[PDB]
C-alpha cells in the first residue's frame, strides 16, 4: 500500500503539501534517540558492520530518518523548535532521558537536531536495556506544558523492548510493562507516537507487538521499519518518500481524531513532570 501511494511522490516537498491538503495544521515535533551499546553492532548487515551512530562523511541511519522526517515536518512547526533527547546511554539506561542541552533547551529546526547530535555522539557511553516508556513519558510532559498542543513524538531506535527471559511463557518485562502503560497513557493527550526502527532489529516481533497494544481512544502510536524500506530495489528519492509516507501518512488522521476527542489545547491535569537529565557531555 505504502509502496502504491509513494510512486506518484518525487520529493519530500509533495509529501509536506499531501499531509496539508489531509489536514495537518500546527504541528511540533519531538525526538528521542537510542543511544543503546547494540548500536555498535546492528550494523553488520544494513551499514557495512559499523556502528550506526558512526559519523563519516556519509550520515548514518540516525542522521538519515532525523532528515526526512525533519524536512517532511518542518513546514507545520511554527517556531521551529524540537525538543530532542537520548536514551540508552549509560547516564540513563532504561529510566530516564537526556535532553541534548542543558536545562531542556529545545534545537531550533533539524539541521541543530543534527549538529548537535554529531556533537554528542563521540562523547557517550552506550548502555542499554532498552524502554520506550521515558521517552514517551518526556514528550507526555511536554505536550502538557505545551497546553495541549499537537505534537509528534518520533523515536529512532536499533531494537524492540527488551523482553523477560520467560517471554514464551507469555511473561512481559518491566519494559515493555512500563512502554505499554505509556502509550496507552498517551493517547490522553494530542500525541502522536512513531517508532522509526533502524539496523539490523530484529523487527519482525515489533509489529505483532505494535497490533497487540490495548484498545485506546484513537490509534496513536505505529512502528516504521526504515531499513526495510531502504533495503528495497528502488529509486533513493523514492525510497525517501515511501519513508516519509509510511512514517507520517496516519498524522493527519491522528490529530483529526484529537480534535474529535477534544484532546487538542487542553491540559489532562493528570501527567507526571518528567524531567530530563542534563547531557552528559563537556
Ligand atoms: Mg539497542
Ligand atoms: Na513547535
Known sequence: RYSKISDNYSSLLQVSEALGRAGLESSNLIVGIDFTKSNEWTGAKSFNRKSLHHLSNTPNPYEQAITIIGRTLA?????????????????????????????????????????????????????????????????????????????????????????????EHGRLSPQEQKTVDAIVKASTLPLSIVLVGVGDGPWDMMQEFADNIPARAFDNFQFVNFTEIMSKNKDQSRKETEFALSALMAIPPQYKATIELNLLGVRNGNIPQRIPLPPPVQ
Request: charged share 20%; hydrophobic share 40%; net charge negative.
Open 75 to 167: 513546514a507545520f512547526d511554527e517556531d521551529n523548535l524540537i525538543p530532542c533527547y537520548g536514551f540508552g546511554d549509560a547516564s540513563t539506561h532504561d529510566q530516564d532521558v537526556f535532553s541534548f542541552y542543558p536545562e531542556g533547551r529545545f534545537c531550533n529546526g533539524f539541521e541543530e537536531v543534527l549538529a548537535r547530535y554529531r556533537e554528542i555522539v563521540p562523547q557517550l557511553k552506550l548502555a542499554g536495556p532498552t524502554s520506550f516508556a521515558p521517552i514517551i513519558e518526556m514528550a507526555m510532559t511536554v505536550v502538557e506544558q505545551s497546553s495541549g498542543q499537537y505534537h509528534v513524538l518520533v523515536i529512532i531506535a536499533d531494537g524492540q523492548v527488551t523482553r523477560s527471559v520467560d517471554t
